[PDB]
Amino acid sequence: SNFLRLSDRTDPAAVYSLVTRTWGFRAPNLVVSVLGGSGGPVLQTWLQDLLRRGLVRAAQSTGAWIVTGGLHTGIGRHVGVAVRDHQ
Amino acid sequence: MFSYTFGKVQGNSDLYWKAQRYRLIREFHSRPALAPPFIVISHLRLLKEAERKLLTWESVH
């Protein structure tokens, strides 16, 4: 699990080049960034189902990247678990 | 009465045959390899995360 610590004021070009070349992640056919605090560690069942079904199925069919808060809580955790399930 | 019975189990002939196929295969899959008359010697010879992944795949489908 490639983990990198970098300064906030960093040009995205270098980061993208690093990810694409050094780490071997192929250029995505799509990128989706999820937003929202999603108050409460446990989220709405309908919301969880919508996310894990729709977004993850779309990513699987297209082979995309998903960018979320790398935190094991709330929406980030739900995205992670759904992605692992579909993998 | 015979004709009615026959017609009843004629539109589903394939289903009945498939069930019988399964029963036969199950019966003969666990039998000694030798035929009865010689089967005496065979009788004497007689004397996880994977499941998690599988269930997740099933649920996805």
PDB file of C-alpha atoms in Angstrom:
ATOM      1  CA  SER A   1       0.000   0.000   0.000  1.00  0.00           C
ATOM      2  CA  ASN A   2       2.063   2.907  -1.310  1.00  0.00           C
ATOM      3  CA  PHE A   3       1.909   5.617   1.370  1.00  0.00           C
ATOM      4  CA  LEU A   4       3.569   8.992   0.840  1.00  0.00           C
ATOM      5  CA  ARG A   5       3.763  12.038   3.092  1.00  0.00           C
ATOM      6  CA  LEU A   6       4.005  15.327   1.210  1.00  0.00           C
ATOM      7  CA  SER A   7       3.680  19.036   1.877  1.00  0.00           C
ATOM      8  CA  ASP A   8       0.292  20.654   1.353  1.00  0.00           C
ATOM      9  CA  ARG A   9       1.747  23.193  -1.102  1.00  0.00           C
ATOM     10  CA  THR A  10       2.864  20.631  -3.676  1.00  0.00           C
ATOM     11  CA  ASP A  11       2.362  20.757  -7.429  1.00  0.00           C
ATOM     12  CA  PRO A  12      -0.016  17.958  -8.513  1.00  0.00           C
ATOM     13  CA  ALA A  13       2.068  17.319 -11.642  1.00  0.00           C
ATOM     14  CA  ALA A  14       4.933  15.697  -9.738  1.00  0.00           C
ATOM     15  CA  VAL A  15       2.522  13.601  -7.668  1.00  0.00           C
ATOM     16  CA  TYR A  16       0.727  12.394 -10.788  1.00  0.00           C
ATOM     17  CA  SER A  17       3.997  11.527 -12.525  1.00  0.00           C
ATOM     18  CA  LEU A  18       5.148   9.611  -9.450  1.00  0.00           C
ATOM     19  CA  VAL A  19       1.916   7.629  -9.200  1.00  0.00           C
ATOM     20  CA  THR A  20       1.763   6.888 -12.922  1.00  0.00           C
ATOM     21  CA  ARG A  21       5.394   5.821 -13.377  1.00  0.00           C
ATOM     22  CA  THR A  22       7.096   4.848 -10.114  1.00  0.00           C
ATOM     23  CA  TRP A  23       4.205   2.963  -8.500  1.00  0.00           C
ATOM     24  CA  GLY A  24       2.980   1.335 -11.713  1.00  0.00           C
ATOM     25  CA  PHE A  25      -0.644   2.457 -11.437  1.00  0.00           C
ATOM     26  CA  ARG A  26      -1.957   2.657 -14.989  1.00  0.00           C
ATOM     27  CA  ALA A  27      -3.557   5.890 -16.116  1.00  0.00           C
ATOM     28  CA  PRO A  28      -7.211   5.779 -15.013  1.00  0.00           C
ATOM     29  CA  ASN A  29     -10.027   5.753 -17.514  1.00  0.00           C
ATOM     30  CA  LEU A  30     -11.993   7.767 -14.934  1.00  0.00           C
ATOM     31  CA  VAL A  31     -11.470   9.426 -11.558  1.00  0.00           C
ATOM     32  CA  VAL A  32     -14.187  10.000  -8.959  1.00  0.00           C
ATOM     33  CA  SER A  33     -13.569  11.949  -5.754  1.00  0.00           C
ATOM     34  CA  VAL A  34     -16.129  11.494  -2.991  1.00  0.00           C
ATOM     35  CA  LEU A  35     -17.058  14.397  -0.723  1.00  0.00           C
ATOM     36  CA  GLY A  36     -19.138  14.974   2.382  1.00  0.00           C
ATOM     37  CA  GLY A  37     -18.463  14.585   6.081  1.00  0.00           C
ATOM     38  CA  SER A  38     -21.147  11.909   6.493  1.00  0.00           C
ATOM     39  CA  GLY A  39     -21.747  12.520  10.180  1.00  0.00           C
ATOM     40  CA  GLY A  40     -22.009   9.268  12.096  1.00  0.00           C
ATOM     41  CA  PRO A  41     -19.689   6.271  11.727  1.00  0.00           C
ATOM     42  CA  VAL A  42     -22.658   4.213  10.493  1.00  0.00           C
ATOM     43  CA  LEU A  43     -24.336   5.613   7.384  1.00  0.00           C
ATOM     44  CA  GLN A  44     -27.833   5.263   5.971  1.00  0.00           C
ATOM     45  CA  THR A  45     -28.535   1.811   4.571  1.00  0.00           C
ATOM     46  CA  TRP A  46     -30.005   3.291   1.394  1.00  0.00           C
ATOM     47  CA  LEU A  47     -26.999   5.587   1.030  1.00  0.00           C
ATOM     48  CA  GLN A  48     -24.572   2.718   1.602  1.00  0.00           C
ATOM     49  CA  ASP A  49     -26.355   0.556  -0.962  1.00  0.00           C
ATOM     50  CA  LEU A  50     -26.493   3.360  -3.518  1.00  0.00           C
ATOM     51  CA  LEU A  51     -22.790   4.058  -3.122  1.00  0.00           C
ATOM     52  CA  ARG A  52     -21.513   0.484  -3.130  1.00  0.00           C
ATOM     53  CA  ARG A  53     -23.753  -0.608  -6.003  1.00  0.00           C
ATOM     54  CA  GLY A  54     -23.791   2.331  -8.387  1.00  0.00           C
ATOM     55  CA  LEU A  55     -20.408   3.970  -7.966  1.00  0.00           C
ATOM     56  CA  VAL A  56     -18.386   0.798  -7.523  1.00  0.00           C
ATOM     57  CA  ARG A  57     -20.108  -1.022 -10.388  1.00  0.00           C
ATOM     58  CA  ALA A  58     -19.422   1.947 -12.655  1.00  0.00           C
ATOM     59  CA  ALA A  59     -15.772   1.922 -11.612  1.00  0.00           C
ATOM     60  CA  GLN A  60     -15.508  -1.836 -12.159  1.00  0.00           C
ATOM     61  CA  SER A  61     -16.977  -1.623 -15.646  1.00  0.00           C
ATOM     62  CA  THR A  62     -14.761   1.319 -16.601  1.00  0.00           C
ATOM     63  CA  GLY A  63     -11.733   0.548 -14.428  1.00  0.00           C
ATOM     64  CA  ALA A  64     -11.477   3.884 -12.635  1.00  0.00           C
ATOM     65  CA  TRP A  65      -9.791   5.425  -9.618  1.00  0.00           C
ATOM     66  CA  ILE A  66     -11.625   6.591  -6.508  1.00  0.00           C
ATOM     67  CA  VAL A  67     -10.201   9.296  -4.239  1.00  0.00           C
ATOM     68  CA  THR A  68     -11.531   9.632  -0.693  1.00  0.00           C
ATOM     69  CA  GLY A  69     -10.284  10.485   2.759  1.00  0.00           C
ATOM     70  CA  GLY A  70      -7.861   7.746   3.742  1.00  0.00           C
ATOM     71  CA  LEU A  71      -9.645   7.274   7.064  1.00  0.00           C
ATOM     72  CA  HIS A  72     -11.237   4.070   8.318  1.00  0.00           C
ATOM     73  CA  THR A  73     -14.449   5.876   9.260  1.00  0.00           C
ATOM     74  CA  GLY A  74     -17.712   6.847   7.623  1.00  0.00           C
ATOM     75  CA  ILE A  75     -17.834   7.374   3.887  1.00  0.00           C
ATOM     76  CA  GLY A  76     -14.164   6.580   3.364  1.00  0.00           C
ATOM     77  CA  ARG A  77     -14.528   3.265   5.164  1.00  0.00           C
ATOM     78  CA  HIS A  78     -17.665   2.444   3.189  1.00  0.00           C
ATOM     79  CA  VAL A  79     -15.924   3.178  -0.110  1.00  0.00           C
ATOM     80  CA  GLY A  80     -12.950   1.071   0.929  1.00  0.00           C
ATOM     81  CA  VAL A  81     -15.045  -1.921   1.933  1.00  0.00           C
ATOM     82  CA  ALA A  82     -17.172  -1.724  -1.213  1.00  0.00           C
ATOM     83  CA  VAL A  83     -14.080  -1.497  -3.417  1.00  0.00           C
ATOM     84  CA  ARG A  84     -12.520  -4.490  -1.677  1.00  0.00           C
ATOM     85  CA  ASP A  85     -15.738  -6.467  -2.097  1.00  0.00           C
ATOM     86  CA  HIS A  86     -15.894  -5.726  -5.813  1.00  0.00           C
ATOM     87  CA  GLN A  87     -12.203  -6.559  -6.204  1.00  0.00           C
TER      88      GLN A  87
ATOM     89  CA  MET B   1     -55.989 -41.807 -16.897  1.00  0.00           C
ATOM     90  CA  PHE B   2     -52.759 -43.154 -18.385  1.00  0.00           C
ATOM     91  CA  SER B   3     -52.839 -40.570 -21.168  1.00  0.00           C
ATOM     92  CA  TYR B   4     -53.404 -37.749 -18.701  1.00  0.00           C
ATOM     93  CA  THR B   5     -50.529 -38.945 -16.516  1.00  0.00           C
ATOM     94  CA  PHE B   6     -48.235 -39.286 -19.522  1.00  0.00           C
ATOM     95  CA  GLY B   7     -49.047 -35.818 -20.801  1.00  0.00           C
ATOM     96  CA  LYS B   8     -48.498 -34.371 -17.342  1.00  0.00           C
ATOM     97  CA  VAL B   9     -44.922 -35.668 -17.143  1.00  0.00           C
ATOM     98  CA  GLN B  10     -44.169 -35.253 -20.844  1.00  0.00           C
ATOM     99  CA  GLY B  11     -43.840 -31.482 -21.053  1.00  0.00           C
ATOM    100  CA  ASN B  12     -41.279 -31.737 -18.247  1.00  0.00           C
ATOM    101  CA  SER B  13     -39.487 -34.841 -19.533  1.00  0.00           C
ATOM    102  CA  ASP B  14     -36.136 -33.068 -19.531  1.00  0.00           C
ATOM    103  CA  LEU B  15     -36.471 -31.938 -15.916  1.00  0.00           C
ATOM    104  CA  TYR B  16     -37.234 -35.447 -14.699  1.00  0.00           C
ATOM    105  CA  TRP B  17     -34.329 -36.846 -16.676  1.00  0.00           C
ATOM    106  CA  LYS B  18     -31.928 -34.276 -15.238  1.00  0.00           C
ATOM    107  CA  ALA B  19     -32.989 -35.114 -11.693  1.00  0.00           C
ATOM    108  CA  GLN B  20     -32.523 -38.815 -12.413  1.00  0.00           C
ATOM    109  CA  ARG B  21     -29.110 -38.030 -13.891  1.00  0.00           C
ATOM    110  CA  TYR B  22     -28.080 -36.378 -10.647  1.00  0.00           C
ATOM    111  CA  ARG B  23     -29.334 -39.278  -8.553  1.00  0.00           C
ATOM    112  CA  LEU B  24     -27.479 -41.808 -10.698  1.00  0.00           C
ATOM    113  CA  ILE B  25     -24.236 -39.828 -10.662  1.00  0.00           C
ATOM    114  CA  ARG B  26     -24.392 -39.434  -6.896  1.00  0.00           C
ATOM    115  CA  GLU B  27     -25.021 -43.149  -6.473  1.00  0.00           C
ATOM    116  CA  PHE B  28     -22.121 -44.247  -8.657  1.00  0.00           C
ATOM    117  CA  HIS B  29     -19.641 -41.569  -7.580  1.00  0.00           C
ATOM    118  CA  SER B  30     -19.148 -43.251  -4.199  1.00  0.00           C
ATOM    119  CA  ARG B  31     -19.060 -46.920  -5.195  1.00  0.00           C
ATOM    120  CA  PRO B  32     -16.113 -49.339  -5.233  1.00  0.00           C
ATOM    121  CA  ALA B  33     -14.425 -49.431  -8.620  1.00  0.00           C
ATOM    122  CA  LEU B  34     -14.909 -53.200  -9.004  1.00  0.00           C
ATOM    123  CA  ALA B  35     -18.061 -54.936 -10.158  1.00  0.00           C
ATOM    124  CA  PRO B  36     -20.108 -56.896  -7.609  1.00  0.00           C
ATOM    125  CA  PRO B  37     -18.838 -60.439  -8.177  1.00  0.00           C
ATOM    126  CA  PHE B  38     -15.247 -59.293  -7.599  1.00  0.00           C
ATOM    127  CA  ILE B  39     -16.206 -56.415  -5.285  1.00  0.00           C
ATOM    128  CA  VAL B  40     -15.269 -58.551  -2.275  1.00  0.00           C
ATOM    129  CA  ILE B  41     -11.604 -57.600  -2.586  1.00  0.00           C
ATOM    130  CA  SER B  42     -12.588 -53.941  -2.823  1.00  0.00           C
ATOM    131  CA  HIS B  43     -14.692 -54.292   0.323  1.00  0.00           C
ATOM    132  CA  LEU B  44     -11.720 -55.854   2.100  1.00  0.00           C
ATOM    133  CA  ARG B  45      -9.558 -52.948   0.952  1.00  0.00           C
ATOM    134  CA  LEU B  46     -12.150 -50.684   2.561  1.00  0.00           C
ATOM    135  CA  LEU B  47     -11.883 -52.663   5.801  1.00  0.00           C
ATOM    136  CA  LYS B  48     -11.844 -19.678   6.198  1.00  0.00           C
ATOM    137  CA  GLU B  49     -11.234 -16.534   4.148  1.00  0.00           C
ATOM    138  CA  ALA B  50     -11.964 -18.530   0.990  1.00  0.00           C
ATOM    139  CA  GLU B  51     -15.588 -18.945   2.050  1.00  0.00           C
ATOM    140  CA  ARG B  52     -15.768 -15.232   2.852  1.00  0.00           C
ATOM    141  CA  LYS B  53     -14.519 -14.346  -0.623  1.00  0.00           C
ATOM    142  CA  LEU B  54     -16.883 -16.817  -2.268  1.00  0.00           C
ATOM    143  CA  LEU B  55     -19.902 -15.456  -0.413  1.00  0.00           C
ATOM    144  CA  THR B  56     -18.938 -11.875  -1.231  1.00  0.00           C
ATOM    145  CA  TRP B  57     -18.687 -12.790  -4.910  1.00  0.00           C
ATOM    146  CA  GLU B  58     -22.082 -14.491  -4.769  1.00  0.00           C
ATOM    147  CA  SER B  59     -23.612 -11.454  -3.078  1.00  0.00           C
ATOM    148  CA  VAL B  60     -22.162  -9.116  -5.699  1.00  0.00           C
ATOM    149  CA  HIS B  61     -23.699 -11.188  -8.468  1.00  0.00           C
TER     150      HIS B  61
END
